[PDB]
Amino acid sequence: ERPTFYRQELNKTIWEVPERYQNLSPVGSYGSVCAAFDTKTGLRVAVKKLSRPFQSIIHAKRTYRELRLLKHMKHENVIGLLDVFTPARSLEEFNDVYLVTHLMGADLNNIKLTDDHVQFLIYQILRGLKYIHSADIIHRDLKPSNLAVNEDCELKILDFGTRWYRAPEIMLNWMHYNQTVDIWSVGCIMAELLTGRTLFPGTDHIDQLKLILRLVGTPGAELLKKISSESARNYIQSLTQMPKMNFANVFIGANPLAVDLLEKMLVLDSDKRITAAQALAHAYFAQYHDPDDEPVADPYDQSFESRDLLIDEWKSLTYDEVISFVPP
Ligand SMILES: Nc1ccc2c(NCCc3ccccc3)nc(-c3ccc(N4CCOCC4)cc3)nc2c1
């Protein structure tokens, strides 16, 4: 059942892929990516050749992690795995991994948008996040360039886990953050789509926190009550007490429902931040929300993350995942 492969060089890089995929066009560079034509399905795909996937234990575990995540994602607003292949015929010669995904038109970084456009884009991000989060997965690095959009405005999240979109508790190095670090990111993205301007374009990590605190205000007593780190509490009590800004004044002219949702996403205290599922129910998405079509994910076994294995063992687990792959 093994297909016939064909070879070619692209940007000082040889590509060995099933004849199924045709007209490989480089799209730039973790991995080299080519645009291609899937003759089996008539669709345009992206083919990613991982670079040095098994170079070290850290790379090998990262390769396995990326394959396991992509094999799990089955949702309209999350990038899924169409195919995965290696030219190798055995574990012994297994050295290269190629991942095949839907070719998306552009990303949000390249795409000021109308409020109706922002509504539909953020709705789709949140629907994808509800699904990812329901599997106990956190994206951790959501940003416009990790959001693919086609000309129909259909959106998919990709490239799971720049400082401009990171939750303050990650900036301050909290070990026990929750899934709503991603909701902070969505809030930064949505703000940028509405205004045309990065919300918090910090020049470094200290400037980044200062910009965030200027908007959302310095932590309240209820939040300090929950801070364990001794420095963190002094640092918080030490810097100039900014007052929380009225978001309606900052996002002047925006739809009041958008301002209200932003207020619920950009909360400094992550215990109080809105979840993806809750945000889908916000009135801002009234014309798109469908509680019967915002599904959750099957459970995802992340137990491998806590394991310390040899480089060859991670490579063998990755090989098993290539062989066991079942296309959609
Ligand atoms: N229940 C909650 C809710 C929120 C929380 C939150 N939010 C970050 C708040 C913040 C305040 C000012 C500037 C940036 C972020 N932050 C931390 C937190 C932040 C940093 C640490 N450190 C890092 C230094 O080494 C000791 C451990 C430990 C805990 N806990 C929270 C617990």
Nearest to 262 by CA among 244, 243, 238: 244
Rounded Cα distance, 141 and 300, in Å:
19
Buried b (16+ CB within 10 A) or exposed e, 304-313: eeeeeeeeee
Q: Whose CA is nearest to atom 30 of ligand 1?
A: 227
CA distance 154 to 104: 9
Determine if ligand 1 sits within 6 Å of the CB of residue 228: yes
Q: Is 173 in the pocket of ligand 1 (CB under 6 A)?
A: yes
| Of 91, 80, 98, 114, nearest in space to 13 by CA | 98
How remote is the CA of residue 174 from the centroid of ligand 1, in Å?
5
Quote the Cα angle for 1-327-86, to 5°.
Answer: 55
Residue from 115, 159, 260, 269 carrying the catalytic annotation: 159
**Residue 232 beta carbon below 6 angstroms from any ligand 1 atom:** yes
Q: Resolution in Å, one decimal, please.
A: 1.9
Contact 279, 126 (CB under 8 A): yes
List, in order, residues 6 or more apart from 153 with CB less than 8 Å away.
117, 120, 121
Residue where the block lists tokens 């004044």: 249
Q: Do the Cβ atoms of 167 and 135 come closer than 8 Å?
A: no
Annotated binding-site residue? 30: yes
Residue nearest atom 8 in ligand 1 by C-alpha distance: 169
Closest-lying ligand 1 atom to the alpha carbon of residue 227: 30
105 annotated as ligand-binding: no
CA distance 170 to 185: 11
Secondary structure E strands in the chain: 5-9, 14-18, 21-28, 31-38, 43-50, 83-85, 98-102, 106-107, 147-149, 155-157
Calpha distance 209→163 (Å, rounded): 10
Residue 146 is encoded by which pair of tokens?
Answer: 């990790």
Q: Do residues 273 and 267 make contact, with C-beta atoms less than 8 angstroms apart? A: yes
Instruction: Write the CB contacts of 83 (distance below 8 Å, at least 6 apart in sequence).
Output: 45, 99, 100, 325, 327
> By what method was this entry solved?
X-ray
Clarify whether 159 is annotated catalytic.
Answer: yes
DSSP state of 84: E
Which atom, in ligand 1's list, is nearest to the CA of 268? Answer: 9
For ligand 1, say whether the CB of 229 is within 6 Å of any of its atoms. Answer: yes
* 80 labeled binding residue: no
218 lines ligand 1 (CB under 6 A): no
Domains, the chain, in order of start with CATH, read: 15-105 (3.30.200.20), 106-296 (1.10.510.10)
CA dist 200 and 211 (Å) reads: 6
